[PDB]
Amino acid sequence: VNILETEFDLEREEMVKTHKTQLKELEDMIETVKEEDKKKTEEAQNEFSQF
Amino acid sequence: NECDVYKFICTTIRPTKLGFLELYDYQQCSKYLSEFVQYEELDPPNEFPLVIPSPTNVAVWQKGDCFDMSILLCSLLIGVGYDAYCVYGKAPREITTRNESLMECLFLEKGKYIEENDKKPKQTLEQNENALLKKPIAHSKWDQTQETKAREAEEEKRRIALTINDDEPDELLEDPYQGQRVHCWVLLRSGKRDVQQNIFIEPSTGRMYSPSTCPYECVDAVFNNLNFWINMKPECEVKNLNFEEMDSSL
Amino acid sequence: KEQEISQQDYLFALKSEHDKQMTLMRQDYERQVNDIKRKYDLKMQNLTKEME
Amino acid sequence: VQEEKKDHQSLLKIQQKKFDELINNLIIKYEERLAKLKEDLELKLKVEIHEL
């Protein structure tokens, strides 16, 4: 029982590390898209106010 | 291995498939490996190295013989989903020392400037039976080929008078270890990850060569991460040695 | 389980590169739409101007 | 992997078709509005001169 709990403890550790790492790394793009949207909006706004 | 404690080669393959794109592609991974490590020349090239390191230290230490990067590539291929084996034997020195100032330079084309001239697209003119072509008339190709021969002789004589045949490389010397060297490479067997057939890989230079024309000399045994196969009849060329009857065939 | 993890990672890398492909190509088609719009803007403005 | 790559390439081609058609229709309607605006300008000149 101890050994059978131990190897699954290690497997749980491994999957936890994997999922944490992908969750941490992947989230970097929605910020870029939102910033692009806001910046293009402001650029279109500035010269229209000028007009 | 580096600890000099006895190890089994069959268990020495550690396939590690990192998420990186560069090493996913067998062709691109081989190219990056060729352009990522200066090749360390085997000595003696005719024998087995003092230590056989695992793929981790192989990628860590950035230098080594054929086995190191070869095991690295084969392990990567196995992890990706291809069909990879490691084959070591006898190969020419040109493979080992990484001297190819005479081998074909595939890089000689890149950067080429091609005239995007005014050869316009010859419009899709309708070939109606009403509109006829230009009538052939009596013209002689006899004088035409005479003229072309005269011109070609002109430039041939000019190039001989203005050019010399000193287009001579520095010949690569004979290999004392040639015919008994121990060099290794990665063999792709057809079937896993859409492999057409068996293809031999040059991990030292990232060059691909085939059994029917490969420079490899001997095939004494092949190995993997799971099974080791021996070749009772290595006196023949790699072309006559079936790489798919490895288990069942005698 | 290592092969399972590697396949999951490869599948998500394929999905992520598809995300990047779609994002970039849609941005480029919208840039083309904008380029066409502005070229037409300039032609219309020019002609209307000398007509004015 | 192979079948999902096939589906993604099919999706890329479908999106190419969709956005090329979008661009073509948009160009057609813009040209239509350019011609209509030309006519708008001729009768604007007409009304201005006649009123004066």
Add this chain to the structure above:
Amino acid sequence: GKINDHVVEMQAAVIQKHQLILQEMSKTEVSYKEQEALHEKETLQILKEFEH
């Protein structure tokens, strides 16, 4: 009713024939255009030679 329907099929077939005839004719002018343009290009090249 019967005369109308069958006569209508009559002019429909005649219309198919006349439409293909119109295509015949228009390709006639097209071919004349290409061959003529070839003639003027050759003549203009020779005339440029003589102007030199």
Add this chain to the structure above:
Amino acid sequence: DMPPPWPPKIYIDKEKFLMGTPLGEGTVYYNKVKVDNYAPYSQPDGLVQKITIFQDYKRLKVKEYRYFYKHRSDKLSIRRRYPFEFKTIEEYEPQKYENKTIPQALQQWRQVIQIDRHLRIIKYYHNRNHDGLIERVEQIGEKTMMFYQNR
């Protein structure tokens, strides 16, 4: 039973992998060629690869200089150099509209091939010009030329 690989899985790093060659620079002698690969973003001009085409196996006389650049501001991906003519050839990839920082003077040069001290033939886009200019061949001392379309 055959035991799986004894050691844990391989490891590699990020910047080291980006660096490409073992010592940052990888030079080898091809058949009458000399290939040198350096890491981009490190060279002040930023050359990435240099396939020095030598007219022989000696690696002495250069045949066709092949500069390669990427990540630059100007986007000069490659430079073609002909030694005998000193001929310099470059071409420009398309650029985005939504880039306010880059002036249109930057959004004009598509291809430029200059030879000698006098000759420079430069070429532009069909659908990315204002006054209709198509291509201009600057000949020093004799004449100026300008092609127009969409005008």
